[PDB]
Amino acid sequence: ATGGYVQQATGQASFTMYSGCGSPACGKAASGFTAAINQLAFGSAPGLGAGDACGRCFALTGNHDPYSPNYTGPFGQTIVVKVTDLCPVQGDQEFCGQTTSNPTNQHGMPFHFDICEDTGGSAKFFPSGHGALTGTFTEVSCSQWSGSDGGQLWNGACLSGETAPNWPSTACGNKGTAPS
Ligand SMILES: OC[C@H]1O[C@@H](O[C@H]2[C@H](O)[C@@H](O)[C@H](O[C@H]3[C@H](O)[C@@H](O)[C@H](O[C@H]4[C@H](O)[C@@H](O)[C@H](O[C@H]5[C@H](O)[C@@H](O)[C@@H](O)O[C@@H]5CO)O[C@@H]4CO)O[C@@H]3CO)O[C@@H]2CO)[C@H](O)[C@@H](O)[C@@H]1O
Ligand SMILES: OC[C@H]1O[C@@H](O[C@H]2[C@H](O)[C@@H](O)[C@H](O[C@H]3[C@H](O)[C@@H](O)[C@H](O[C@H]4[C@H](O)[C@@H](O)[C@H](O[C@H]5[C@H](O)[C@@H](O)[C@H](O)O[C@@H]5CO)O[C@@H]4CO)O[C@@H]3CO)O[C@@H]2CO)[C@H](O)[C@@H](O)[C@@H]1O
Ligand SMILES: CC(CCO)CCO
Ligand SMILES: CC(CCO)CCO
Ligand SMILES: CC(CCO)CCO
């Protein structure tokens, strides 16, 4: 996409959980299940506000535990998240360090979703004792996502991806150039 960001509607991803998604990089939180996506897909950098991932909805499915490769299941449910946040290339390497020259993380995954625990998404997705997984994602209509957006936290906040056709398309837009 514009800026060199790698923004595909479907693919393979790794998955983790995180706390504290109420002040996220898109500038609006949401009450439904939400995630941060790795910088190369988010479409912005820390401090620059929203990228084109903001507001888009994705169905996430875990199908492997990379730390326990002998584990065959059960995995969690498929969930639909709204992307509200950035998992930055600086400070979140093993999982979110994908760049244009090295587009996969340490698990060989070209995307990463950090699923917010606060609002319940991670409890639906991660079995007890298995808090990091790999699997798939597919962008879906936000008709498939339950929840309500939060209020704008600063000027330029954006979740307009929530009404956009799937990538390739432009809603909030990308900021600057993707990490190299
Ligand atoms: O930066 C992104 C994001 O990270 C968030 O934290 C992540 C963290 O990055 C990630 O490394 C961490 O991964 C945990 C994982 O959640 C947990 O399930 C896993 O537990 C393993 C355990 O390590 C193994 O010892 C155990 O092996 C057993 C075998 O299963 C069994 O068959 C037998 O062989 O005995 C073995 C020993 O008991 O399996 C467990 C399950 O696989 O350990 C990983 C490494 O610590 O996950 C967290 C949370 O997602 C962070 O919160 C966020 O803020 C940040 O943005
Ligand atoms: O008034 C001056 C100027 O302001 C502009 O608006 C600014 C606004 O002032 C800033 O507060 C705002 O800052 C946001 C950053 O742009 C955004 O990158 C950052 O995103 C964080 C997110 O908060 C955080 O949850 C996320 O955490 C990941 C962590 O890295 C992990 O440790 C954690 O566990 O898990 C998550 C998921 O992986 O990281 C990101 C990235 O650091 O959030 C800030 C607060 O919302 O930026 C605005 C835009 O520049 C305004 O637009 C101008 O008009 C005005 O003049
Ligand atoms: C070929 C595309 C899906 C159909 O529009 C790739 C999605 O990013
Ligand atoms: C859980 C929500 C309560 C207000 O709707 C906010 C989470 O961002
Ligand atoms: C995360 C657990 C409950 C599903 O919501 C795994 C059970 O499959």
mmCIF file of C-alpha atoms and ligand atoms in Angstrom:
data_model
loop_
_atom_site.group_PDB
_atom_site.id
_atom_site.type_symbol
_atom_site.label_atom_id
_atom_site.label_comp_id
_atom_site.label_asym_id
_atom_site.label_seq_id
_atom_site.Cartn_x
_atom_site.Cartn_y
_atom_site.Cartn_z
ATOM 1 C CA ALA A 1 0.000 0.000 0.000
ATOM 2 C CA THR A 2 0.955 3.664 -0.011
ATOM 3 C CA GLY A 3 4.016 4.117 2.154
ATOM 4 C CA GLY A 4 5.223 0.597 1.407
ATOM 5 C CA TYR A 5 3.081 -0.868 4.183
ATOM 6 C CA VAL A 6 2.114 -4.520 3.734
ATOM 7 C CA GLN A 7 -1.667 -4.466 4.073
ATOM 8 C CA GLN A 8 -3.338 -7.654 2.884
ATOM 9 C CA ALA A 9 -6.912 -8.633 3.642
ATOM 10 C CA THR A 10 -5.984 -12.244 4.428
ATOM 11 C CA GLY A 11 -2.873 -14.055 5.514
ATOM 12 C CA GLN A 12 -0.979 -15.764 8.283
ATOM 13 C CA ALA A 13 -0.293 -14.126 11.621
ATOM 14 C CA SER A 14 1.034 -14.668 15.078
ATOM 15 C CA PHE A 15 -1.115 -13.744 18.069
ATOM 16 C CA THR A 16 -0.485 -12.503 21.605
ATOM 17 C CA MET A 17 -2.562 -10.744 24.273
ATOM 18 C CA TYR A 18 -2.006 -7.373 25.909
ATOM 19 C CA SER A 19 -3.411 -5.153 28.619
ATOM 20 C CA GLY A 20 -4.519 -1.572 28.418
ATOM 21 C CA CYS A 21 -6.126 -0.775 25.100
ATOM 22 C CA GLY A 22 -8.144 2.244 26.172
ATOM 23 C CA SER A 23 -5.775 4.895 24.734
ATOM 24 C CA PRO A 24 -4.720 3.265 21.485
ATOM 25 C CA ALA A 25 -2.813 4.519 18.458
ATOM 26 C CA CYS A 26 -5.858 5.068 16.234
ATOM 27 C CA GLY A 27 -7.096 7.637 18.769
ATOM 28 C CA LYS A 28 -10.345 5.825 19.599
ATOM 29 C CA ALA A 29 -10.801 2.704 21.650
ATOM 30 C CA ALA A 30 -13.828 0.442 21.258
ATOM 31 C CA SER A 31 -15.958 -1.661 23.563
ATOM 32 C CA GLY A 32 -15.908 -4.776 21.382
ATOM 33 C CA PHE A 33 -12.949 -7.057 20.857
ATOM 34 C CA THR A 34 -9.957 -5.080 19.624
ATOM 35 C CA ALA A 35 -6.398 -5.657 18.575
ATOM 36 C CA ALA A 36 -3.148 -3.956 17.829
ATOM 37 C CA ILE A 37 -1.585 -4.927 14.492
ATOM 38 C CA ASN A 38 2.118 -4.904 13.660
ATOM 39 C CA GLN A 39 3.471 -1.596 12.351
ATOM 40 C CA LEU A 40 4.140 -2.805 8.804
ATOM 41 C CA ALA A 41 0.387 -3.494 8.475
ATOM 42 C CA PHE A 42 -0.873 -0.709 10.774
ATOM 43 C CA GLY A 43 0.176 2.022 8.358
ATOM 44 C CA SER A 44 1.742 4.538 10.758
ATOM 45 C CA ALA A 45 4.541 4.904 13.326
ATOM 46 C CA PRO A 46 4.512 5.765 17.038
ATOM 47 C CA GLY A 47 3.357 9.315 17.594
ATOM 48 C CA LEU A 48 1.932 9.796 14.103
ATOM 49 C CA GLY A 49 -1.605 8.629 14.945
ATOM 50 C CA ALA A 50 -3.880 6.532 12.794
ATOM 51 C CA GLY A 51 -2.852 4.305 9.903
ATOM 52 C CA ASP A 52 -5.052 2.608 7.341
ATOM 53 C CA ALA A 53 -5.589 -0.501 9.475
ATOM 54 C CA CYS A 54 -7.618 1.636 11.897
ATOM 55 C CA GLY A 55 -11.198 0.499 12.317
ATOM 56 C CA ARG A 56 -10.925 -2.515 10.034
ATOM 57 C CA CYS A 57 -12.410 -5.791 11.273
ATOM 58 C CA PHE A 58 -10.699 -9.169 11.014
ATOM 59 C CA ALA A 59 -11.653 -12.752 11.797
ATOM 60 C CA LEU A 60 -8.738 -14.388 13.644
ATOM 61 C CA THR A 61 -8.151 -18.147 13.927
ATOM 62 C CA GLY A 62 -5.404 -19.812 15.946
ATOM 63 C CA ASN A 63 -4.207 -23.235 14.800
ATOM 64 C CA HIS A 64 -0.721 -23.743 16.312
ATOM 65 C CA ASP A 65 1.133 -23.050 19.517
ATOM 66 C CA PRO A 66 4.687 -22.210 18.427
ATOM 67 C CA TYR A 67 6.024 -22.680 21.965
ATOM 68 C CA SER A 68 4.422 -26.142 22.253
ATOM 69 C CA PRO A 69 4.479 -27.564 18.773
ATOM 70 C CA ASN A 70 3.274 -30.985 20.019
ATOM 71 C CA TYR A 71 -0.036 -29.433 21.170
ATOM 72 C CA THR A 72 -2.833 -30.414 18.737
ATOM 73 C CA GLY A 73 -5.683 -28.533 20.384
ATOM 74 C CA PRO A 74 -8.162 -27.520 21.366
ATOM 75 C CA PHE A 75 -7.571 -24.006 20.182
ATOM 76 C CA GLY A 76 -9.904 -21.109 20.966
ATOM 77 C CA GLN A 77 -12.794 -19.719 18.989
ATOM 78 C CA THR A 78 -12.473 -17.690 15.843
ATOM 79 C CA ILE A 79 -13.102 -14.082 16.903
ATOM 80 C CA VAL A 80 -13.710 -10.831 15.069
ATOM 81 C CA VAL A 81 -11.562 -7.927 16.231
ATOM 82 C CA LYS A 82 -11.511 -4.276 15.275
ATOM 83 C CA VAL A 83 -7.985 -2.894 14.883
ATOM 84 C CA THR A 84 -7.601 0.148 17.137
ATOM 85 C CA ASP A 85 -3.898 0.025 17.982
ATOM 86 C CA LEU A 86 -0.298 -0.292 16.833
ATOM 87 C CA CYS A 87 2.175 -3.023 17.795
ATOM 88 C CA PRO A 88 5.372 -1.091 17.056
ATOM 89 C CA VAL A 89 8.474 -2.381 15.335
ATOM 90 C CA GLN A 90 10.553 -0.718 18.072
ATOM 91 C CA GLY A 91 10.117 -2.487 21.420
ATOM 92 C CA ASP A 92 7.972 -5.376 20.186
ATOM 93 C CA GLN A 93 10.508 -7.367 18.032
ATOM 94 C CA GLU A 94 9.830 -11.235 18.278
ATOM 95 C CA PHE A 95 6.327 -10.547 17.027
ATOM 96 C CA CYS A 96 5.943 -7.035 15.531
ATOM 97 C CA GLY A 97 9.309 -6.342 13.920
ATOM 98 C CA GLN A 98 8.297 -7.042 10.318
ATOM 99 C CA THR A 99 9.832 -4.554 7.880
ATOM 100 C CA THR A 100 9.843 -4.103 4.101
ATOM 101 C CA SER A 101 13.275 -5.740 3.827
ATOM 102 C CA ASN A 102 12.485 -8.476 6.393
ATOM 103 C CA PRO A 103 8.726 -8.942 6.197
ATOM 104 C CA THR A 104 8.391 -11.829 8.678
ATOM 105 C CA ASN A 105 8.827 -11.932 12.441
ATOM 106 C CA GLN A 106 10.797 -14.527 14.472
ATOM 107 C CA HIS A 107 7.925 -17.018 13.912
ATOM 108 C CA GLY A 108 8.066 -16.504 10.156
ATOM 109 C CA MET A 109 4.770 -14.633 10.340
ATOM 110 C CA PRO A 110 4.145 -11.642 8.047
ATOM 111 C CA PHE A 111 1.483 -10.158 10.377
ATOM 112 C CA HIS A 112 0.836 -10.004 14.100
ATOM 113 C CA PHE A 113 -2.319 -9.300 16.097
ATOM 114 C CA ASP A 114 -1.975 -8.363 19.774
ATOM 115 C CA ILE A 115 -5.465 -9.055 21.103
ATOM 116 C CA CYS A 116 -6.652 -6.810 23.932
ATOM 117 C CA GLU A 117 -7.452 -8.708 27.117
ATOM 118 C CA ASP A 118 -9.440 -5.903 28.767
ATOM 119 C CA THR A 119 -12.629 -6.284 26.721
ATOM 120 C CA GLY A 120 -12.671 -10.087 26.470
ATOM 121 C CA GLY A 121 -11.160 -10.939 23.103
ATOM 122 C CA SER A 122 -8.172 -12.804 24.415
ATOM 123 C CA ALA A 123 -10.271 -15.037 26.705
ATOM 124 C CA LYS A 124 -12.287 -16.193 23.669
ATOM 125 C CA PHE A 125 -9.176 -16.860 21.579
ATOM 126 C CA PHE A 126 -6.419 -18.232 23.835
ATOM 127 C CA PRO A 127 -6.941 -21.509 25.710
ATOM 128 C CA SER A 128 -5.817 -21.493 29.320
ATOM 129 C CA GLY A 129 -2.074 -22.101 29.346
ATOM 130 C CA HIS A 130 -1.555 -21.101 25.689
ATOM 131 C CA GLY A 131 -1.219 -17.328 25.437
ATOM 132 C CA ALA A 132 0.610 -17.021 22.108
ATOM 133 C CA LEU A 133 -0.419 -18.756 18.886
ATOM 134 C CA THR A 134 -0.084 -18.640 15.118
ATOM 135 C CA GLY A 135 -2.822 -18.994 12.534
ATOM 136 C CA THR A 136 -4.822 -16.961 10.040
ATOM 137 C CA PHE A 137 -6.755 -13.771 9.608
ATOM 138 C CA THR A 138 -9.310 -12.580 7.091
ATOM 139 C CA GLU A 139 -10.754 -9.079 6.850
ATOM 140 C CA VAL A 140 -14.535 -9.091 7.212
ATOM 141 C CA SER A 141 -17.314 -6.558 7.242
ATOM 142 C CA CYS A 142 -17.657 -4.827 10.595
ATOM 143 C CA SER A 143 -21.235 -6.120 10.472
ATOM 144 C CA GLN A 144 -19.534 -9.205 11.961
ATOM 145 C CA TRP A 145 -18.120 -7.238 14.943
ATOM 146 C CA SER A 146 -20.019 -6.504 18.126
ATOM 147 C CA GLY A 147 -19.272 -3.275 19.965
ATOM 148 C CA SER A 148 -19.243 0.485 19.960
ATOM 149 C CA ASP A 149 -16.419 2.886 19.231
ATOM 150 C CA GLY A 150 -15.091 5.136 21.951
ATOM 151 C CA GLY A 151 -14.758 8.881 21.744
ATOM 152 C CA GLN A 152 -11.994 10.698 19.894
ATOM 153 C CA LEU A 153 -8.933 11.120 22.131
ATOM 154 C CA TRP A 154 -7.156 13.714 20.012
ATOM 155 C CA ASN A 155 -7.637 15.581 16.744
ATOM 156 C CA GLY A 156 -7.141 13.263 13.794
ATOM 157 C CA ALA A 157 -8.291 10.130 15.617
ATOM 158 C CA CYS A 158 -9.788 7.725 13.107
ATOM 159 C CA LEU A 159 -11.585 4.373 12.886
ATOM 160 C CA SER A 160 -13.050 5.008 9.421
ATOM 161 C CA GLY A 161 -11.709 1.702 8.159
ATOM 162 C CA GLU A 162 -14.817 0.282 9.870
ATOM 163 C CA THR A 163 -16.973 1.303 6.882
ATOM 164 C CA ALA A 164 -14.425 0.665 4.114
ATOM 165 C CA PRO A 165 -14.326 -2.159 1.618
ATOM 166 C CA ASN A 166 -11.566 -4.621 2.404
ATOM 167 C CA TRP A 167 -7.987 -3.911 1.469
ATOM 168 C CA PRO A 168 -6.953 -2.848 -1.077
ATOM 169 C CA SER A 169 -8.727 0.427 -0.312
ATOM 170 C CA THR A 170 -8.138 3.625 1.664
ATOM 171 C CA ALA A 171 -10.006 4.913 4.693
ATOM 172 C CA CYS A 172 -7.893 6.576 7.420
ATOM 173 C CA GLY A 173 -4.812 6.455 5.191
ATOM 174 C CA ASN A 174 -1.205 5.585 5.898
ATOM 175 C CA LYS A 175 1.261 8.000 7.496
ATOM 176 C CA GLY A 176 4.839 8.205 6.358
ATOM 177 C CA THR A 177 6.870 5.284 5.105
ATOM 178 C CA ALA A 178 6.872 1.733 6.358
ATOM 179 C CA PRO A 179 9.854 0.589 8.402
ATOM 180 C CA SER A 180 12.637 -0.771 6.203
HETATM 181 O O1 LIG B 1 5.250 -7.893 22.121
HETATM 182 C C1 LIG B 1 3.950 -8.398 21.821
HETATM 183 C C2 LIG B 1 3.075 -8.536 23.090
HETATM 184 O O2 LIG B 1 3.592 -9.596 23.898
HETATM 185 C C3 LIG B 1 2.712 -9.945 24.936
HETATM 186 O O3 LIG B 1 3.350 -10.958 25.708
HETATM 187 C C4 LIG B 1 3.397 -12.242 25.067
HETATM 188 C C5 LIG B 1 4.830 -12.601 24.861
HETATM 189 O O4 LIG B 1 5.403 -11.787 23.838
HETATM 190 C C6 LIG B 1 4.992 -14.068 24.475
HETATM 191 O O5 LIG B 1 6.351 -14.362 24.376
HETATM 192 C C7 LIG B 1 4.303 -14.900 25.526
HETATM 193 O O6 LIG B 1 4.433 -16.261 25.142
HETATM 194 C C8 LIG B 1 4.209 -17.227 26.186
HETATM 195 C C9 LIG B 1 2.886 -17.893 25.951
HETATM 196 O O7 LIG B 1 1.828 -17.023 26.232
HETATM 197 C C10 LIG B 1 2.727 -19.161 26.804
HETATM 198 O O8 LIG B 1 1.603 -19.867 26.368
HETATM 199 C C11 LIG B 1 3.942 -20.037 26.636
HETATM 200 O O9 LIG B 1 3.832 -21.099 27.569
HETATM 201 C C12 LIG B 1 4.507 -22.294 27.167
HETATM 202 C C13 LIG B 1 5.714 -22.502 28.021
HETATM 203 O O10 LIG B 1 6.713 -21.566 27.653
HETATM 204 C C14 LIG B 1 6.299 -23.898 27.813
HETATM 205 O O11 LIG B 1 7.257 -24.112 28.808
HETATM 206 C C15 LIG B 1 5.239 -24.965 27.899
HETATM 207 O O12 LIG B 1 5.850 -26.158 27.387
HETATM 208 C C16 LIG B 1 5.330 -27.411 27.940
HETATM 209 C C17 LIG B 1 4.717 -28.244 26.831
HETATM 210 O O13 LIG B 1 3.495 -27.670 26.380
HETATM 211 C C18 LIG B 1 4.437 -29.668 27.319
HETATM 212 O O14 LIG B 1 4.086 -30.475 26.237
HETATM 213 C C19 LIG B 1 5.671 -30.243 27.963
HETATM 214 O O15 LIG B 1 6.701 -30.354 26.993
HETATM 215 O O16 LIG B 1 6.088 -29.418 29.017
HETATM 216 C C20 LIG B 1 6.466 -28.153 28.587
HETATM 217 C C21 LIG B 1 6.946 -27.358 29.819
HETATM 218 O O17 LIG B 1 5.832 -27.186 30.696
HETATM 219 O O18 LIG B 1 4.155 -24.656 27.062
HETATM 220 C C22 LIG B 1 3.513 -23.421 27.347
HETATM 221 C C23 LIG B 1 2.386 -23.247 26.350
HETATM 222 O O19 LIG B 1 2.928 -23.340 25.030
HETATM 223 O O20 LIG B 1 5.103 -19.319 26.966
HETATM 224 C C24 LIG B 1 5.335 -18.247 26.067
HETATM 225 C C25 LIG B 1 6.703 -17.611 26.330
HETATM 226 O O21 LIG B 1 6.704 -16.940 27.594
HETATM 227 O O22 LIG B 1 2.959 -14.572 25.531
HETATM 228 C C26 LIG B 1 2.718 -13.234 25.995
HETATM 229 C C27 LIG B 1 1.231 -13.001 26.080
HETATM 230 O O23 LIG B 1 0.598 -13.105 24.805
HETATM 231 C C28 LIG B 1 2.503 -8.765 25.857
HETATM 232 O O24 LIG B 1 1.527 -9.081 26.837
HETATM 233 C C29 LIG B 1 2.104 -7.527 25.090
HETATM 234 O O25 LIG B 1 2.068 -6.416 25.997
HETATM 235 C C30 LIG B 1 3.045 -7.277 23.929
HETATM 236 O O26 LIG B 1 2.625 -6.172 23.191
HETATM 237 O O1 LIG B 2 -1.511 18.494 20.377
HETATM 238 C C1 LIG B 2 -0.345 18.227 19.588
HETATM 239 C C2 LIG B 2 -0.771 17.396 18.387
HETATM 240 O O2 LIG B 2 -1.320 16.167 18.854
HETATM 241 C C3 LIG B 2 -1.759 15.300 17.814
HETATM 242 O O3 LIG B 2 -2.344 14.161 18.426
HETATM 243 C C4 LIG B 2 -1.401 13.233 18.950
HETATM 244 C C5 LIG B 2 -1.688 13.067 20.437
HETATM 245 O O4 LIG B 2 -1.345 14.263 21.134
HETATM 246 C C6 LIG B 2 -0.877 11.922 21.013
HETATM 247 O O5 LIG B 2 -1.287 11.656 22.359
HETATM 248 C C7 LIG B 2 -1.103 10.672 20.185
HETATM 249 O O6 LIG B 2 -0.288 9.649 20.737
HETATM 250 C C8 LIG B 2 -0.663 8.340 20.335
HETATM 251 C C9 LIG B 2 0.409 7.842 19.376
HETATM 252 O O7 LIG B 2 0.318 8.491 18.097
HETATM 253 C C10 LIG B 2 0.277 6.344 19.166
HETATM 254 O O8 LIG B 2 1.329 5.921 18.285
HETATM 255 C C11 LIG B 2 0.275 5.616 20.511
HETATM 256 O O9 LIG B 2 0.080 4.230 20.280
HETATM 257 C C12 LIG B 2 0.579 3.335 21.270
HETATM 258 C C13 LIG B 2 -0.608 2.755 22.041
HETATM 259 O O10 LIG B 2 -1.067 3.730 23.004
HETATM 260 C C14 LIG B 2 -0.214 1.532 22.847
HETATM 261 O O11 LIG B 2 -1.376 0.878 23.436
HETATM 262 C C15 LIG B 2 0.552 0.571 21.949
HETATM 263 O O12 LIG B 2 0.950 -0.416 22.865
HETATM 264 C C16 LIG B 2 1.399 -1.585 22.248
HETATM 265 C C17 LIG B 2 2.654 -1.468 23.090
HETATM 266 O O13 LIG B 2 3.755 -1.051 22.280
HETATM 267 C C18 LIG B 2 2.916 -2.685 23.948
HETATM 268 O O14 LIG B 2 3.878 -2.341 24.951
HETATM 269 C C19 LIG B 2 1.567 -2.958 24.580
HETATM 270 O O15 LIG B 2 1.613 -4.001 25.497
HETATM 271 O O16 LIG B 2 0.747 -3.550 23.627
HETATM 272 C C20 LIG B 2 0.341 -2.651 22.592
HETATM 273 C C21 LIG B 2 -0.093 -3.479 21.387
HETATM 274 O O17 LIG B 2 1.074 -4.118 20.839
HETATM 275 O O18 LIG B 2 1.685 1.136 21.272
HETATM 276 C C22 LIG B 2 1.318 2.260 20.477
HETATM 277 C C23 LIG B 2 2.560 2.822 19.780
HETATM 278 O O19 LIG B 2 3.476 3.391 20.720
HETATM 279 O O20 LIG B 2 -0.839 6.082 21.269
HETATM 280 C C24 LIG B 2 -0.741 7.468 21.589
HETATM 281 C C25 LIG B 2 -1.924 7.844 22.475
HETATM 282 O O21 LIG B 2 -3.176 7.553 21.836
HETATM 283 O O22 LIG B 2 -0.719 10.925 18.836
HETATM 284 C C26 LIG B 2 -1.563 11.900 18.222
HETATM 285 C C27 LIG B 2 -1.273 12.008 16.725
HETATM 286 O O23 LIG B 2 0.027 12.556 16.483
HETATM 287 C C28 LIG B 2 -2.831 15.977 16.970
HETATM 288 O O24 LIG B 2 -3.193 15.114 15.886
HETATM 289 C C29 LIG B 2 -2.325 17.306 16.429
HETATM 290 O O25 LIG B 2 -3.387 17.982 15.747
HETATM 291 C C30 LIG B 2 -1.810 18.160 17.578
HETATM 292 O O26 LIG B 2 -1.218 19.359 17.068
HETATM 293 C C1 LIG B 3 -6.957 -10.110 -4.100
HETATM 294 C C2 LIG B 3 -7.341 -9.364 -2.831
HETATM 295 C C3 LIG B 3 -8.688 -9.819 -2.295
HETATM 296 C C4 LIG B 3 -9.825 -9.561 -3.276
HETATM 297 O O1 LIG B 3 -10.036 -8.160 -3.398
HETATM 298 C C5 LIG B 3 -6.217 -9.207 -1.800
HETATM 299 C C6 LIG B 3 -6.661 -8.569 -0.482
HETATM 300 O O2 LIG B 3 -5.742 -7.679 0.171
HETATM 301 C C1 LIG B 4 -15.537 -1.292 27.803
HETATM 302 C C2 LIG B 4 -15.948 0.082 27.322
HETATM 303 C C3 LIG B 4 -16.916 0.733 28.285
HETATM 304 C C4 LIG B 4 -17.523 1.983 27.694
HETATM 305 O O1 LIG B 4 -18.294 1.589 26.580
HETATM 306 C C5 LIG B 4 -14.764 0.975 27.033
HETATM 307 C C6 LIG B 4 -13.579 0.175 26.549
HETATM 308 O O2 LIG B 4 -12.853 0.981 25.661
HETATM 309 C C1 LIG B 5 -10.343 -20.157 24.781
HETATM 310 C C2 LIG B 5 -11.091 -21.405 25.194
HETATM 311 C C3 LIG B 5 -12.579 -21.120 25.239
HETATM 312 C C4 LIG B 5 -13.123 -20.710 23.886
HETATM 313 O O1 LIG B 5 -13.871 -19.520 24.025
HETATM 314 C C5 LIG B 5 -10.739 -22.560 24.279
HETATM 315 C C6 LIG B 5 -11.852 -23.574 24.117
HETATM 316 O O2 LIG B 5 -11.871 -24.001 22.773
#
